[PDB]
Amino acid sequence: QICIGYHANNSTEKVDTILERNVTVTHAKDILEKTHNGKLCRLSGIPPLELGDCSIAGWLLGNPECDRLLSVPEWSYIVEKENPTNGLCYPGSFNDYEELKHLLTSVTHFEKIKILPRDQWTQHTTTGGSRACAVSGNPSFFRNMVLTKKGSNYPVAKRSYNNTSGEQMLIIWGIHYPNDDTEQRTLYQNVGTYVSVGTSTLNKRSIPEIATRPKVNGQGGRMEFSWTLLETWDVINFESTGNLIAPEYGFKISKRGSSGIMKTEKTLENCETKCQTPLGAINTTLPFHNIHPLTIGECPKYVKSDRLVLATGLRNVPGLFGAIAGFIEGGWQGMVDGWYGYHHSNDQGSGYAADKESTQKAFDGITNKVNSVIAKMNTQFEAVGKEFSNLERRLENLNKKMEDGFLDVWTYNAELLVLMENERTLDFHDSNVKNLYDKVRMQLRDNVKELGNGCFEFYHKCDDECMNSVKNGTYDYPKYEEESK
Amino acid sequence: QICIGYHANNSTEKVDTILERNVTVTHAKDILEKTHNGKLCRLSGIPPLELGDCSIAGWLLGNPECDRLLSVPEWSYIVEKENPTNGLCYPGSFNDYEELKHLLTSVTHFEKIKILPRDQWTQHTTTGGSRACAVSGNPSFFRNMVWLTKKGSNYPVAKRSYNNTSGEQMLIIWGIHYPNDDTEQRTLYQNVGTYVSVGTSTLNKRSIPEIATRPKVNGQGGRMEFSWTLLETWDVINFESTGNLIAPEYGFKISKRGSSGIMKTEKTLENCETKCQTPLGAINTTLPFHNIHPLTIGECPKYVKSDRLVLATGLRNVPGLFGAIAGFIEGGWQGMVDGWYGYHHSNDQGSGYAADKESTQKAFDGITNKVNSVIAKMNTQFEAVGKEFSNLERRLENLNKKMEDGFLDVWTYNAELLVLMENERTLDFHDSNVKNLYDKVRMQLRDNVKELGNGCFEFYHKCDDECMNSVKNGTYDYPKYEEESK
C-alpha cells in the first residue's frame, strides 16, 4: 500500500480568490507594506531642512523669531509645520510664494551672503523698525532687509550688485504700503513714488497701493515682497524714490532636481531612508503600501486596500483538478519536509516520505510568481505633496483629481491581481498533486488497485527498496507479474 | 444506466473570451451601465442651483433678467447653459471669474445679506442707471450693486466699511467703472484724479480708472471691472473712492463642505434623485462601468469607450481546457431545469433527470463571488469631471484633457481584457466541474460499471431508484454489488 497526499499544518492564514472567500492556506505572504519606523530620516544621506515653526518667508526675510534656526547647506526636502507661527511678522504678501518654495525644495548648496551692506545707504535712514517685528520689546525688523527719509529728504536711492559669487543667487526685495497719504509723506516725502528692480531678464516697477486696512499685528501698513534669480556675472539695479525695503543679503543656490515640503511636527532623528512619509520612514521591497498618501522618495505605490495577501502554500484541510479537498479528501498533519508526498504501509514500516522532485518545482514557481509581482514595479523618485495659493483652487483640484485617479487604478489592479493570482496558486498546488497521483498510477497499472481516496493497494509483496523506487520514479512493471486479481 | 451531463437552454446570449469570439453562453451579465433616466436630478437629497440662462456673474450681480431666478440656500451642483444669455448687461470683466465659479460650485449654506444699505450713501447719487441694463424701458442697473454718482456738482470722498459679524465667511463683490471718455467721467463723477480703494486683513487694492475709446457692446463704450473677496468673520472691509466705484449693497454668507462642478445642459430640474448625474440624465447602478457621457457629477461608475462588457456566468451552451463540455460529453440537456450539472438515469422503474445539488451550489457560489469581486473592488469617490478654463488657459485645459483621456484609455483596456480573461476562466471552470463530476462516479463504481462513451456508465448489475440515490449522493457501496455479468 502506497498513498499520495499533501501537506497540512496548523496555520490559520486566510486569503481570498476570485472564486472563494476566507480560504485557509498553508503559507502566505503579504505584499502590502504597512509599517514605518516612526522616525523622520535623511533622504539618501542628505538631511531635510527643518524650519521648526517658521515659514520659508520668515526664514529668508530674517524674522527675529527664526534667529535660532541652523541652516544646513544642502537638504533633500523641507520640513514645515502645516500652519507655521513665524512668517511675515510685518503684515504683507509674497509674490509667487508657492513657486519660490517649490524651487528651494531641494538644494545642492545654499549659502547666505552679504551683497548690499546697510551702512552704505549714506543718504537715507536705515533703522526704521516696527513693533510688529518686536524683540521684547523694541521695534525691530526682518534681519535680512533694510529705507526712510533723512531729515525731510528722500533722494533717489540707487544701488546695484554684480553677482560675482560664481553661483546663481536668490534675491528678495519689498515695497511698503502705508495707511494713508500722510504716513506716506512722514516716511518718504514725495508721494508719486516707485520702486524699480531690473536685471538682464527681470524688469519691474511697483507703486504704493494705499487703502484703509484693519490692523494685523497692530499694523495697518503692508509690505509686499518679490524675488528673482540673478544669473552669474549679471547685475541687479535697484532704484527708488520711496517705499523700498532693500535686501542686505542674497542667497547662493545650486540645484540638481526638485523635491517637496513635508508638513509635520516630527524632528530629524538620524537614520536613513529611500522613502519618507509624515508618519515615519518606510523600508520595503513590496510594491504597495498604505501608510500615508504624502510620501517623498522612491516609494511603493499607495493603495486604499489594507490587505494584499498572496497565497504561497496550498489549501489547508484537517478545486479545479479534483484532488486537493477533492478525491484526496484531507491533508496530512504528519508530513513536514515537503508540500506533496507519499505514505506507505509495508511489512517493514510506514511511511511518510515527502516528494523532493516535485515540492522543489513548486517552491521555485511560487518564488518566481511572488518576485514577478514585486520586481516589475517601476518606482522613480517623486514628491507627491504640493502647494497652491487660494486663487489656485482649480489647479489644486486638478492635482487631487489626478492623484485620486491613480489611486483608484492601483487599488483596483492590486486587489484584482491578488484575487486572480490566488485562484491560480491554489489550482497550481491542486494540479501538482493530481499529477503526482497520475505519475504513480501510470507506473503501477495492473500491479496495483486504485482505492479512491488517493491510494494504491499492491497486488504483490513490496518492500522498502520497492517504494523507494516508486518514489524515485523507477519501478519496473515486468518484475511483478503476480496477478492476485 | 447512469449518465453525466450539463444544462443547456434556449439562450442566444453571446460573450467573447481571450481565445474565441462570439460564444453562446447559458446565462450572462452585462457589467456596463448603458441607460439613464433622461431627467435632471437632485443629488443625494440636494438640488442643483439652476441658472436658467443667466451666468453666475449675472446672477450674483443681480442682472434684472435674473429676477425670476429662484435662489435656494443649499445646492450640490450648478446647472448653466453653454452660452448663457444674461451675464454682464453692462459690458466688462470679472477678475478671477473661473476661481469664483469653482468656489460657488457646491455650498452647504448660502444666504444673501444686506451689508451696505443704499440709503446710507447720503452724500452721493444712488439711482444711477444705464440703458444697457434697462427695465422696460427705463435705465436700470445690477440690483445687488450700487452705482455711486455725483450729487449736485459734488462727489465727496465715498468712505464706508463693514465688519463681518454674520457668523460665516462672506463673499463680497465690487466694481470700478471705466468710462468711454472725459465727458462721461465729468458728468458722472465731477472729479478726475479718481481712484477706488479696497482693503481687508489680507486684501489690499487700489484701482485707477482707464478712460479710453472702445467698440460698443450693448451700446456701451464704457466697461465695468468686478473683483471679489472672501471676508473672514469678525474681519472688516474698507471701501474708499473719489469716483468710479460700483459698490456692493449685499454680501453672501457662504459655507462649504466640499467642492462640485458646473453641469452645462439645456435640461431642467425634475424631481427625482441620484448618486450620479450626467448631462443626458441620471444613472442608478451597481455596475463598475458606464458609457453614457464623460461629464458626470457624483459617485459614478468608470466611464469607458467600450459599449459591450458581458460576463459569462453560465456555461458554453450546447443544445474546453478539461475536455468535457462540448468535448467527451457531446452536448447539454434542455431537460435538466433545476441545476447546472447532474445525472440522467435509466431504470427498470423510471427515468430520469436528477440535478446535482452539491456541485451546482459550489458553482452558484463561485460565480456569484467572481461577479461581486469585479463589481465590489471598484472604489468610487464623488468627483466633478467637468472643468472651467479661460481663453488664456488653453495649455491647462489641454493638460486636464490629456489626463481625463489617459484614464479613459487605462480603464477601457483593463475592463475589456478583464472581461475577456475572466470569461475564458469562467467557461473552463464549468468544464472542470463537469469533468470532476464524471470522475467522482467513475472512481466510485470502478468495475461495477463500464465506461460507455459520452459521460455514460452502464451497470454490470441491477440498480433501482435507491441504489441510484447512493451514487448521486456519494455513498455508493461497491462491495455489495459483486455481480459480474462481465
Added chain:
Amino acid sequence: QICIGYHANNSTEKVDTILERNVTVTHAKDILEKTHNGKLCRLSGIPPLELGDCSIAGWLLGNPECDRLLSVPEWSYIVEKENPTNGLCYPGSFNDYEELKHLLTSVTHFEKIKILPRDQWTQHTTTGGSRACAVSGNPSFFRNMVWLTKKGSNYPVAKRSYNNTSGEQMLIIWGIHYPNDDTEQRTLYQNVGTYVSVGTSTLNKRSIPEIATRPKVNGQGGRMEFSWTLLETWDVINFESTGNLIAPEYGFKISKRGSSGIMKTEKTLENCETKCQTPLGAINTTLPFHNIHPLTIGECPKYVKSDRLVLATGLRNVPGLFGAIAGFIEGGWQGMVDGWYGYHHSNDQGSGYAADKESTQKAFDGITNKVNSVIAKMNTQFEAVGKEFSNLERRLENLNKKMEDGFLDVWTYNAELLVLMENERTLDFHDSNVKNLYDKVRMQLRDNVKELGNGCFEFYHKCDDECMNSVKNGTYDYPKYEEESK
C-alpha cells in the same frame, strides 16, 4: 502502437511567465515596437511649420534673421530647436508666450495681412531702428512692426483703429518700449507721462513705460514688452498712444481645427508620411507598445519603460499544469512538421508522423485570437505629449511630469504582467490540448489497447495503415476488434 506527440524545432526564442523564466518556446511574437525610420515627416498629409533656428516670437515679429524662412499656409505641428538663436533680437519679453505658441501649434489655414500700413502714420517718424536688429550693417528692426518716434520735437497722440473684415479670426501683436532713462525717453518720444492703450470688444489694456537702468542685453539697455490678442471677425481694435508704442503693420488670419505640439529637434523635414512622429523619427506600427521616446506627436502606441515584450504563440520547445508536455509525454518530435500536435504509429507498413489538423487548427485560431485581443483593444486618440512652461510655472510643469510618469508606471506594469500572465496560460493551453488529444484516443480504445506510459498505447490486434485513420480522425469502432491477447 499509437503515440500522441507534439511539435519541436530549432527555435532559440525565449519567453518569461509568472512561474518560470527563460522558457524556450516554439514560436513568439514581440508586441513592443522599437524601430523608427529616423526621418522627420509630415503628419497625415500635412507638414510641420519649420522654424530653422528662429523662435516663434522671432518669426511673428519679423526678425531680419527669418526673412528666408519659407512659410506654409497649413502645418500640423511645429519644429523648433530646443534653444533658438534668433528671437527677440532687441531685448524684452512676450506676455503669455506659452499660450501663444500653444495656439499656433497646429493651424488650418494661416496668412499674413497688412492691417496698418506704416506710411499712414503721417504725424510720426517710422524709420526708427536699432543696432541690436542690424542688417549688414545698418540699424533695422522687426520687419512686421513699426517703431513710432517723434517728428522734429513732436509726438502727437498716435491713434489708429482697424475693423477685422478679413472673415477669419485674427492674431495681432503690439509692443511697448521700456527705455533706459529719462533722456532716452525724451529724445525718442518728447513727452514723459506716456501710455499705450489697446482696446477691443473684450480686450482693454493700458500700459505705462517702466523707465529704469538695466544691464545691457544685445548691447541694449531698453526692453520691449509685447502683447497679443485675437481680434474676432467684424470687431475693431483701437490703438492710442502718447509714446512708446511699437505698432503692428501686419495681422495674421488664423483658423484651427484642433491642437498639436512643438517638437524640439535638430532634424529637418524629410518628405515622407506618418500617423505618428517622434523627435528621433517616425513610427509605422500595429503594435500597442513602444519604447522609442516619450515625446511623440500623433496617434501613437503606449510608451513603456520596458524593452522586451514577448508573447509565446507556439509551445514549450522540448528536444505542465496538465501533466502532458514535458510530463508523462517527455519529449517533442522534431520529426512531425505539419502541425503542433499529432501521432506516431508503429506498424507493418509506414511509420510514422501524422499531424492532427483539426486540433492544431483550433489552437492556431485561439492563439491568433489572443494576440489580436491584446493588440486590437488598445484605444489610441491623437495626442502631443511634449509641453511648454515659462520658468515661473515650475509647479505646473512638475504636475505634468507627475502625470506622464504616472501613466508610464501604469502601462509598463500592466503590460509586463499581461505578457507574463498570458504566457503561463498559453503554455498551459498547449499542454491541455495534447492531454485532451491523448484522452480522446484512450476513451476510444480501452480494453482494446495497453496504456504503456510515455503517451503510447499498445494494441491488442492488427491495425493496418487504414485502421489508424479511424483513431486519428476520431471515428473508430470498438465493436469490430474482439481479439483478446490477454
